[PDB]
């Protein structure tokens, strides 16, 4: 399911860390800020958790943020007039791949979206790889793309 999939892709770290773009993050890939200021990240963390964390959270707190973040990704899809029709056209496994992408990059994939809605899976997979996303995080992008190409969990198993 989407939680297991993103837990694999994001890991779990209980202290503030930097993501692949160098941005302060915590938990299961929860972005805190794009600001280079660790103090700004710590303020965002305390606001998100509701207590003075000093840059460290518990596993329960990380999992709660993760639930909120997955929910937010789903809502960003459902509220977006470009994403919702494609998402609704997908089966349950491919819907997880869609949520995964939105979780990672947030709300340029117009042509890939069309190919996915048309169920041209190999063509969509080729188009999805022609991206900064694929070049910068190729192993994760390959897993997500394989999920779109096959409609199976094979890349995660
Ligand atoms: C961005 C993509 C090509 C994947 C996707 C599809 C549907 C909804 C959200 C994301």
Structure tokens at 40: 């700004």
Residue 66: CB atoms within 10 Å? 20
* 66-72: Cβ within 8 A, 24+ apart: 66/3, 66/6, 66/7, 66/27, 66/28, 66/29, 66/30, 67/3, 69/28, 69/29, 69/30, 69/103, 70/2, 70/3, 70/6, 70/99, 70/103
Answer for the pair 31, 38: CB distance below 8 angstroms, yes or no: no
- Name all residues whose Cβ lies below 6 A of ligand 1: 77, 83, 86-87, 98, 101-102, 109, 112-113, 116
**CATH number of the domain to which 111 belongs:** 1.10.530.40
Q: Is 116 left (phi over 0), alpha (psi -120 to 50) or beta?
A: alpha
Resolution (A): 1.1
> Hey, whose CA ends up nearest to atom 9 of ligand 1?
98
The number of distinct structural domains making up the chain is: 1
Its domain, for residue 64, covers 2-156
Return the percent helix, strand and coil in the chain, to nearest 5. 60, 10, 30
Experimental method of this PDB entry? X-ray
User: Is there a contact between 27 and 66 (Cβ–Cβ < 8 Å)?
Assistant: yes
Instruction: Establish whether 71 is a catalytic residue.
Output: no
φ, ψ (nearest 5 deg) of residue 103: -60, -45
């Amino acid at each position: 399911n989407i939680f297991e999939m993103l837990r694999i892709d994001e890991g779990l770290r209980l202290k503030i860390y930097k993501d692949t773009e160098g941005y302060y993050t915590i938990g299961i890939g929860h972005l805190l800020t794009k600001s280079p200021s660790l103090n700004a990240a710590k303020s965002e963390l305390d606001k998100a958790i509701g207590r003075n964390c000093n840059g460290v959270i518990t596993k329960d707190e990380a999992e709660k943020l993760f639930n909120q973040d997955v929910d937010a990704a789903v809502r960003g899809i459902l509220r977006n007039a470009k994403l919702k029709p494609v998402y609704d056209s997908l089966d349950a496994v491919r819907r997880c791949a869609a949520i995964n992408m939105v979780f990672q990059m947030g709300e340029g994939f117009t042509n890939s979206l069309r190919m996915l809605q048309q169920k041209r899976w190999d063509e969509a997979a080729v188009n999805l790889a022609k991206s900064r996303w694929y070049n910068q995080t190729p192993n994760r992008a390959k897993r997500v793309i394989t999920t779109f190409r096959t409609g199976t969990w094979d890349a995660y198993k």
